[PDB]
Every structure is written in C-alpha cells, then in structure tokens.
Amino acid sequence: DFLSVGKLELPGSMIGAVRDRAIDSGVLAKLSPEQPTIFGPVKGAVFSGV
Amino acid sequence: DFLSVGKLELPGSMIGAVRDRAIDSGVLAKLSPEQPTIFGPVKGAVFSGV
C-alpha cells in the first residue's frame, strides 16, 4: 500500500560497552596493604604471645 | 628461655656468580687470521711438483 522501511534494509547501529561497571574483583586488597617486594621467597617475623 | 635467631630462619646474602674455569674460546683465531668472504662455497687450485 506504501513505501516502508523493510524494503530499505537498514544495517543498524552499535552501542558496545559501558565504561564503568561494578566488578567483584578482589576483597582482600581492601583489608590489608599490598607490601610489594622483590621476586623470591618472602620471610618475616611472627609475634604471638602476650 | 630467650629469643634465639634459630626460630627466625634467616635468609642470608649472595656472594655472586662465579665461573669455575677460565674460558677456552679458541686457537684457530690466533694462529690463522680470519679472512672473511661472501656466502657460498670456497675453492682453490694447488699446483704441486716440479
């Protein structure tokens, strides 16, 4: 009955990603500092009693 | 009784990296001076006898 959009097959458009979603990631990094060190086995001292 | 340095297992220090023997590189390079050529075979003629 008339000219439509169906005959003019449109490709569309892309809206890929959102830049900042909330990710679980890592909890531990929140409770204690990172203490970065040199490669190799790490050793420290443990004070136990009172 | 007291706080020893045995419980606290110490790491230590690195002297370095020493090579056992002196390097025995070459002898052909000292007796006959290297005469470099292009890639490919080499060939020479020898005229012997009188």
PDB file of C-alpha atoms in Angstrom:
ATOM      1  CA  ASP A   1       0.000   0.000   0.000  1.00  0.00           C
ATOM      2  CA  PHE A   2       3.004   2.262   0.581  1.00  0.00           C
ATOM      3  CA  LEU A   3       6.795   2.504   0.743  1.00  0.00           C
ATOM      4  CA  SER A   4       8.160   1.238   4.062  1.00  0.00           C
ATOM      5  CA  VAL A   5      11.490   0.745   5.829  1.00  0.00           C
ATOM      6  CA  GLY A   6      11.515  -3.010   5.238  1.00  0.00           C
ATOM      7  CA  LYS A   7      12.413  -2.589   1.572  1.00  0.00           C
ATOM      8  CA  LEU A   8      15.219  -0.235   2.573  1.00  0.00           C
ATOM      9  CA  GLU A   9      17.116  -2.813   4.638  1.00  0.00           C
ATOM     10  CA  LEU A  10      18.904  -0.788   7.317  1.00  0.00           C
ATOM     11  CA  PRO A  11      22.130  -2.094   8.914  1.00  0.00           C
ATOM     12  CA  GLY A  12      21.577  -0.650  12.389  1.00  0.00           C
ATOM     13  CA  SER A  13      23.982   0.755  14.965  1.00  0.00           C
ATOM     14  CA  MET A  14      26.404  -0.388  17.666  1.00  0.00           C
ATOM     15  CA  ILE A  15      26.414   0.606  21.340  1.00  0.00           C
ATOM     16  CA  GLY A  16      29.121  -1.791  22.507  1.00  0.00           C
ATOM     17  CA  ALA A  17      30.094  -1.282  26.130  1.00  0.00           C
ATOM     18  CA  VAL A  18      29.682   0.845  29.239  1.00  0.00           C
ATOM     19  CA  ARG A  19      32.998   2.171  30.549  1.00  0.00           C
ATOM     20  CA  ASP A  20      32.475   1.532  34.268  1.00  0.00           C
ATOM     21  CA  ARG A  21      30.561  -1.468  35.597  1.00  0.00           C
ATOM     22  CA  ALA A  22      30.872  -2.720  39.172  1.00  0.00           C
ATOM     23  CA  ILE A  23      33.046  -5.839  39.324  1.00  0.00           C
ATOM     24  CA  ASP A  24      33.555  -8.135  42.329  1.00  0.00           C
ATOM     25  CA  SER A  25      37.326  -8.133  41.749  1.00  0.00           C
ATOM     26  CA  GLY A  26      39.283  -8.679  44.962  1.00  0.00           C
ATOM     27  CA  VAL A  27      38.145  -8.116  48.547  1.00  0.00           C
ATOM     28  CA  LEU A  28      41.420  -8.924  50.341  1.00  0.00           C
ATOM     29  CA  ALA A  29      43.157  -5.875  48.877  1.00  0.00           C
ATOM     30  CA  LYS A  30      40.693  -3.830  50.939  1.00  0.00           C
ATOM     31  CA  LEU A  31      41.529  -5.262  54.359  1.00  0.00           C
ATOM     32  CA  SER A  32      45.334  -5.097  54.258  1.00  0.00           C
ATOM     33  CA  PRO A  33      48.119  -3.152  52.469  1.00  0.00           C
ATOM     34  CA  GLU A  34      49.883  -4.645  49.449  1.00  0.00           C
ATOM     35  CA  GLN A  35      53.511  -4.704  50.689  1.00  0.00           C
ATOM     36  CA  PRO A  36      55.257  -5.207  47.317  1.00  0.00           C
ATOM     37  CA  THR A  37      58.633  -6.987  47.353  1.00  0.00           C
ATOM     38  CA  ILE A  38      61.423  -8.359  45.160  1.00  0.00           C
ATOM     39  CA  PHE A  39      60.988 -11.723  43.415  1.00  0.00           C
ATOM     40  CA  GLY A  40      61.813 -14.703  45.616  1.00  0.00           C
ATOM     41  CA  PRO A  41      60.524 -16.386  48.801  1.00  0.00           C
ATOM     42  CA  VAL A  42      59.374 -13.902  51.442  1.00  0.00           C
ATOM     43  CA  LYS A  43      60.112 -14.317  55.156  1.00  0.00           C
ATOM     44  CA  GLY A  44      59.036 -12.307  58.195  1.00  0.00           C
ATOM     45  CA  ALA A  45      58.682 -12.448  61.977  1.00  0.00           C
ATOM     46  CA  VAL A  46      55.605 -13.527  63.951  1.00  0.00           C
ATOM     47  CA  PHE A  47      54.980 -12.111  67.429  1.00  0.00           C
ATOM     48  CA  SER A  48      52.478 -14.420  69.115  1.00  0.00           C
ATOM     49  CA  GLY A  49      52.214 -14.357  72.908  1.00  0.00           C
ATOM     50  CA  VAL A  50      51.438 -11.598  75.394  1.00  0.00           C
TER      51      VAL A  50
ATOM     52  CA  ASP B   1      64.284 -19.142  77.999  1.00  0.00           C
ATOM     53  CA  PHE B   2      65.096 -16.427  75.456  1.00  0.00           C
ATOM     54  CA  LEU B   3      64.602 -15.271  71.862  1.00  0.00           C
ATOM     55  CA  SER B   4      67.033 -17.147  69.623  1.00  0.00           C
ATOM     56  CA  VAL B   5      67.957 -16.497  65.996  1.00  0.00           C
ATOM     57  CA  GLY B   6      67.175 -20.123  65.189  1.00  0.00           C
ATOM     58  CA  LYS B   7      63.391 -19.851  65.256  1.00  0.00           C
ATOM     59  CA  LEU B   8      63.731 -16.845  62.967  1.00  0.00           C
ATOM     60  CA  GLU B   9      65.159 -18.710  59.971  1.00  0.00           C
ATOM     61  CA  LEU B  10      67.402 -16.117  58.329  1.00  0.00           C
ATOM     62  CA  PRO B  11      67.734 -15.810  54.529  1.00  0.00           C
ATOM     63  CA  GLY B  12      71.300 -14.578  54.037  1.00  0.00           C
ATOM     64  CA  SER B  13      73.449 -12.870  51.417  1.00  0.00           C
ATOM     65  CA  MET B  14      74.637 -13.596  47.877  1.00  0.00           C
ATOM     66  CA  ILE B  15      78.366 -13.714  47.127  1.00  0.00           C
ATOM     67  CA  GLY B  16      77.615 -13.520  43.416  1.00  0.00           C
ATOM     68  CA  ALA B  17      78.017 -15.667  40.316  1.00  0.00           C
ATOM     69  CA  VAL B  18      81.460 -17.131  39.648  1.00  0.00           C
ATOM     70  CA  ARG B  19      82.524 -19.229  36.666  1.00  0.00           C
ATOM     71  CA  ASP B  20      84.559 -22.327  37.575  1.00  0.00           C
ATOM     72  CA  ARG B  21      87.110 -22.389  34.753  1.00  0.00           C
ATOM     73  CA  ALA B  22      88.667 -19.715  32.577  1.00  0.00           C
ATOM     74  CA  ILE B  23      87.081 -19.729  29.127  1.00  0.00           C
ATOM     75  CA  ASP B  24      88.851 -21.798  26.463  1.00  0.00           C
ATOM     76  CA  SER B  25      87.372 -19.933  23.491  1.00  0.00           C
ATOM     77  CA  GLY B  26      89.637 -20.610  20.517  1.00  0.00           C
ATOM     78  CA  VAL B  27      93.060 -21.160  18.973  1.00  0.00           C
ATOM     79  CA  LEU B  28      92.381 -21.118  15.228  1.00  0.00           C
ATOM     80  CA  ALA B  29      91.610 -17.402  15.529  1.00  0.00           C
ATOM     81  CA  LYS B  30      95.083 -16.711  16.931  1.00  0.00           C
ATOM     82  CA  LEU B  31      97.196 -18.786  14.540  1.00  0.00           C
ATOM     83  CA  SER B  32      95.491 -18.086  11.212  1.00  0.00           C
ATOM     84  CA  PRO B  33      93.941 -14.609  10.724  1.00  0.00           C
ATOM     85  CA  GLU B  34      90.274 -14.827   9.717  1.00  0.00           C
ATOM     86  CA  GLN B  35      89.770 -13.996   6.043  1.00  0.00           C
ATOM     87  CA  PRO B  36      86.007 -13.390   5.646  1.00  0.00           C
ATOM     88  CA  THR B  37      84.194 -13.981   2.353  1.00  0.00           C
ATOM     89  CA  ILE B  38      80.666 -13.805   0.951  1.00  0.00           C
ATOM     90  CA  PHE B  39      78.206 -16.665   1.409  1.00  0.00           C
ATOM     91  CA  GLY B  40      78.715 -19.808  -0.649  1.00  0.00           C
ATOM     92  CA  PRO B  41      81.415 -22.461  -1.144  1.00  0.00           C
ATOM     93  CA  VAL B  42      85.118 -21.710  -1.472  1.00  0.00           C
ATOM     94  CA  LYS B  43      87.601 -23.353  -3.825  1.00  0.00           C
ATOM     95  CA  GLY B  44      91.293 -23.089  -4.628  1.00  0.00           C
ATOM     96  CA  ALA B  45      93.787 -24.540  -7.093  1.00  0.00           C
ATOM     97  CA  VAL B  46      97.070 -26.115  -5.992  1.00  0.00           C
ATOM     98  CA  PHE B  47      99.979 -26.589  -8.399  1.00  0.00           C
ATOM     99  CA  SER B  48     102.319 -29.217  -6.958  1.00  0.00           C
ATOM    100  CA  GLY B  49     105.562 -30.769  -8.172  1.00  0.00           C
ATOM    101  CA  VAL B  50     108.373 -29.728 -10.496  1.00  0.00           C
TER     102      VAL B  50
END
